[PDB]
RNA sequence: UCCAAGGCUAAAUACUCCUGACUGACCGAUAGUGAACCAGUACCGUGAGGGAAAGGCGAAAAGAACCCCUGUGAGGGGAG
């Protein structure tokens, strides 16, 4: 069976998190945790948090053997964007989008 | 045909800030008032003035006790 965890609302771009998600998609739980704990990217702490929560759900709610799990699916979607104003020169203003991301991870044997 | 250089005179006529009742081949949230919502507000302007956006869980809050991951965070998964 497939055990899910969701991390709706990470304060980071989905583009910046998809690079991290592409390197753990399909890996075993142990290898994925190694990649995430030694990544230099900020998206990896979010992905590691969501993955650890999914593994905890699989151990606790579903009673699965953690040693045989793997990151069966993972995808990052775009969340709600905060809109801000950045002043520029000559009295002009640009809109700034502070993007967020939703991280969905599904572990499975 | 009528008697200025004295004064008056209701009704039938005009209108709606409003009160009551009732109606609509009027609108239904970019519409209908600018304004269904804490709106002439926020915001802009020295000022006169200009002037927004923004409604809906469910029949009933019964609005998720408790457990788990997490930083007693967010967010989620079970349970209900």
PDB file of C-alpha atoms (C1' of nucleotides) in Angstrom, chain B:
ATOM      1  C1'   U B   1     -65.341  94.841 -25.846  1.00  0.00           C
ATOM      2  C1'   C B   2     -63.239  96.134 -21.123  1.00  0.00           C
ATOM      3  C1'   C B   3     -62.166  99.965 -16.884  1.00  0.00           C
ATOM      4  C1'   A B   4     -55.070 100.061 -15.257  1.00  0.00           C
ATOM      5  C1'   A B   5     -52.292 103.000 -11.888  1.00  0.00           C
ATOM      6  C1'   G B   6     -55.648  99.022  -4.128  1.00  0.00           C
ATOM      7  C1'   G B   7     -55.345  93.918  -1.955  1.00  0.00           C
ATOM      8  C1'   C B   8     -56.566  88.830  -1.935  1.00  0.00           C
ATOM      9  C1'   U B   9     -58.353  83.787  -3.476  1.00  0.00           C
ATOM     10  C1'   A B  10     -59.168  76.592  -3.137  1.00  0.00           C
ATOM     11  C1'   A B  11     -58.895  72.783  -6.888  1.00  0.00           C
ATOM     12  C1'   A B  12     -57.071  70.513 -11.001  1.00  0.00           C
ATOM     13  C1'   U B  13     -50.311  71.251 -11.741  1.00  0.00           C
ATOM     14  C1'   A B  14     -44.530  70.329  -9.977  1.00  0.00           C
ATOM     15  C1'   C B  15     -41.454  67.098  -6.752  1.00  0.00           C
ATOM     16  C1'   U B  16     -39.134  62.987  -3.271  1.00  0.00           C
ATOM     17  C1'   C B  17     -34.416  63.433   1.855  1.00  0.00           C
ATOM     18  C1'   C B  18     -38.321  60.561   3.485  1.00  0.00           C
ATOM     19  C1'   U B  19     -42.965  56.923   6.130  1.00  0.00           C
ATOM     20  C1'   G B  20     -46.413  52.606   4.910  1.00  0.00           C
ATOM     21  C1'   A B  21     -48.188  49.087   1.668  1.00  0.00           C
ATOM     22  C1'   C B  22     -47.633  46.704  -2.782  1.00  0.00           C
ATOM     23  C1'   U B  23     -45.375  45.568  -7.574  1.00  0.00           C
ATOM     24  C1'   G B  24     -41.677  44.284 -11.489  1.00  0.00           C
ATOM     25  C1'   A B  25     -40.831  39.409 -18.979  1.00  0.00           C
ATOM     26  C1'   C B  26     -35.278  44.820 -13.250  1.00  0.00           C
ATOM     27  C1'   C B  27     -29.762  42.916 -11.416  1.00  0.00           C
ATOM     28  C1'   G B  28     -27.766  38.733  -8.864  1.00  0.00           C
ATOM     29  C1'   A B  29     -21.305  39.681  -6.491  1.00  0.00           C
ATOM     30  C1'   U B  30     -16.644  42.298 -13.089  1.00  0.00           C
ATOM     31  C1'   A B  31     -24.076  42.711 -12.389  1.00  0.00           C
ATOM     32  C1'   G B  32     -27.160  45.864  -9.281  1.00  0.00           C
ATOM     33  C1'   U B  33     -25.685  51.853  -5.686  1.00  0.00           C
ATOM     34  C1'   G B  34     -19.044  53.752  -5.500  1.00  0.00           C
ATOM     35  C1'   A B  35     -20.526  50.737  -1.335  1.00  0.00           C
ATOM     36  C1'   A B  36     -24.501  42.865  -0.242  1.00  0.00           C
ATOM     37  C1'   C B  37     -18.648  42.515   3.457  1.00  0.00           C
ATOM     38  C1'   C B  38     -16.779  47.548   9.656  1.00  0.00           C
ATOM     39  C1'   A B  39     -17.454  52.162   2.098  1.00  0.00           C
ATOM     40  C1'   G B  40     -17.316  57.348   1.071  1.00  0.00           C
ATOM     41  C1'   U B  41     -13.654  53.043   4.141  1.00  0.00           C
ATOM     42  C1'   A B  42      -8.516  51.665   2.649  1.00  0.00           C
ATOM     43  C1'   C B  43      -5.523  54.290  -0.474  1.00  0.00           C
ATOM     44  C1'   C B  44      -4.010  58.830  -3.414  1.00  0.00           C
ATOM     45  C1'   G B  45      -3.835  64.433  -2.958  1.00  0.00           C
ATOM     46  C1'   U B  46      -1.376  70.612   0.553  1.00  0.00           C
ATOM     47  C1'   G B  47      -6.300  71.149  -0.692  1.00  0.00           C
ATOM     48  C1'   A B  48     -10.798  71.371  -3.292  1.00  0.00           C
ATOM     49  C1'   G B  49     -11.186  66.445  -4.716  1.00  0.00           C
ATOM     50  C1'   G B  50     -10.638  61.431  -6.491  1.00  0.00           C
ATOM     51  C1'   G B  51     -11.745  56.670  -4.812  1.00  0.00           C
ATOM     52  C1'   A B  52     -11.240  50.682  -4.699  1.00  0.00           C
ATOM     53  C1'   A B  53     -10.928  45.497  -3.606  1.00  0.00           C
ATOM     54  C1'   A B  54     -13.462  42.201  -0.648  1.00  0.00           C
ATOM     55  C1'   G B  55     -20.260  37.490  -0.337  1.00  0.00           C
ATOM     56  C1'   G B  56     -21.244  31.287   0.039  1.00  0.00           C
ATOM     57  C1'   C B  57     -18.226  24.885   5.310  1.00  0.00           C
ATOM     58  C1'   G B  58     -22.249  22.105   6.943  1.00  0.00           C
ATOM     59  C1'   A B  59     -29.089  20.722   7.735  1.00  0.00           C
ATOM     60  C1'   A B  60     -26.786  21.239  12.607  1.00  0.00           C
ATOM     61  C1'   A B  61     -20.198  23.189  14.679  1.00  0.00           C
ATOM     62  C1'   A B  62     -21.476  17.845  15.293  1.00  0.00           C
ATOM     63  C1'   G B  63     -15.316  23.195  13.648  1.00  0.00           C
ATOM     64  C1'   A B  64     -11.750  17.141  14.086  1.00  0.00           C
ATOM     65  C1'   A B  65     -10.881  14.385  21.986  1.00  0.00           C
ATOM     66  C1'   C B  66      -6.619  11.307  21.434  1.00  0.00           C
ATOM     67  C1'   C B  67      -2.099   9.255  18.887  1.00  0.00           C
ATOM     68  C1'   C B  68       2.112   9.999  15.337  1.00  0.00           C
ATOM     69  C1'   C B  69       6.107  13.028  12.357  1.00  0.00           C
ATOM     70  C1'   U B  70       7.777  18.116  13.229  1.00  0.00           C
ATOM     71  C1'   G B  71      10.926  23.289  16.352  1.00  0.00           C
ATOM     72  C1'   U B  72       5.182  22.299  21.981  1.00  0.00           C
ATOM     73  C1'   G B  73       6.135  25.914  14.541  1.00  0.00           C
ATOM     74  C1'   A B  74       3.757  25.301   9.823  1.00  0.00           C
ATOM     75  C1'   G B  75       1.931  21.192   7.285  1.00  0.00           C
ATOM     76  C1'   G B  76       0.221  16.469   7.194  1.00  0.00           C
ATOM     77  C1'   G B  77      -1.263  11.050   8.358  1.00  0.00           C
ATOM     78  C1'   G B  78      -4.406   8.064  11.483  1.00  0.00           C
ATOM     79  C1'   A B  79      -8.657   8.296  14.798  1.00  0.00           C
ATOM     80  C1'   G B  80     -13.394  10.562  15.317  1.00  0.00           C
TER      81        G B  80
END
